[PDB]
Design a protein around this ligand. Structure first.
Ligand SMILES: CCCN(C)S(=O)(=O)c1cc(-c2n[nH]c(=O)n2-c2ccccc2F)c(O)cc1O
Length: 209
């Protein structure tokens, strides 16, 4: 069963700003999502130092980048801590409130959209390139869930029926028709090169056959 929720007013406002502002430096989305994946990997690695059984769901700690030209999707997979149902519906939105409000105030004061990460709301930059975002996630303490939004003020959460992922998060970006450059190997490599040194986990780019 699928449940539909409204985004918090400030998040809905930020999403409409990101979608409707003319902004050509769209490549920032990839650095933001990789940074988030790295933070989720730090979380599970840290927890595993006091409880090694936290890695029973998978010991490999990495990030995979999977472009798919046929489906027009860019998938970012990590084996981080994952997210609970409470994270998806409430708690991430609550933690984001101050940063979202502060980021929109900064933008009105002439700040650049590339500053989004400095406000802890980097995820929403995915809407610069994606018409729809699907997030499949699995936390040790909960079931596997699918979160999805095409913006427009709402998102859905459902228990995922698909392939079990063990632990971690898969972000599926359904790219806008004019944003297919982010499916090119050379383009992905170029973007990641301005970021991989700060990432303490292997980033593997899957080459299409
Ligand atoms: C509903 C959208 C969720 N995203 C796709 S996300 O927030 O960008 C994002 C989240 C995680 C994630 N898993 N576990 C966890 O704690 N995090 C996390 C990391 C950083 C900040 C807040 C967070 F919860 C991830 O592994 C990759 C992501 O792209």
């Amino acid at each position: 069963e699928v449940e539909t929720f409204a985004f918090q007013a400030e998040i809905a406002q930020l999403m409409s700003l990101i979608i409707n502002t003319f902004y050509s430096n769209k490549e920032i989305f990839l650095r933001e999502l990789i940074s988030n994946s790295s933070d989720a990997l730090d979380k599970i690695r840290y927890e595993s130092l006091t409880d090694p059984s936290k890695l029973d769901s998978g010991k490999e700690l990495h990030i995979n980048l999977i472009p798919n030209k046929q489906d027009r999707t860019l998938t970012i997979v990590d084996t981080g801590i994952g997210m609970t149902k409470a994270d998806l519906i409430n708690n991430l939105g609550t933690i984001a409130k101050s940063g979202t409000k502060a980021f929109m105030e900064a933008l009105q004061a002439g700040a650049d959209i590339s500053m989004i990460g400095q406000f802890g709301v980097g995820f929403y930059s995915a809407y610069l390139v994606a018409e729809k975002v699907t997030v499949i996630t699995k936390h040790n303490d909960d079931e596997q869930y699918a979160w999805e939004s095409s913006a427009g003020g709402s998102f859905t959460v459902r228990t995922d029926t698909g392939e079990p992922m063990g632990r971690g998060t898969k972000v599926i970006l359904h790219l806008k028709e004019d944003q297919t450059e982010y499916l090119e190997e050379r383009r992905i490599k170029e973007i990641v090169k301005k970021h991989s040194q700060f990432i303490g986990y292997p980033i593997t780019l899957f080459v299409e056959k």
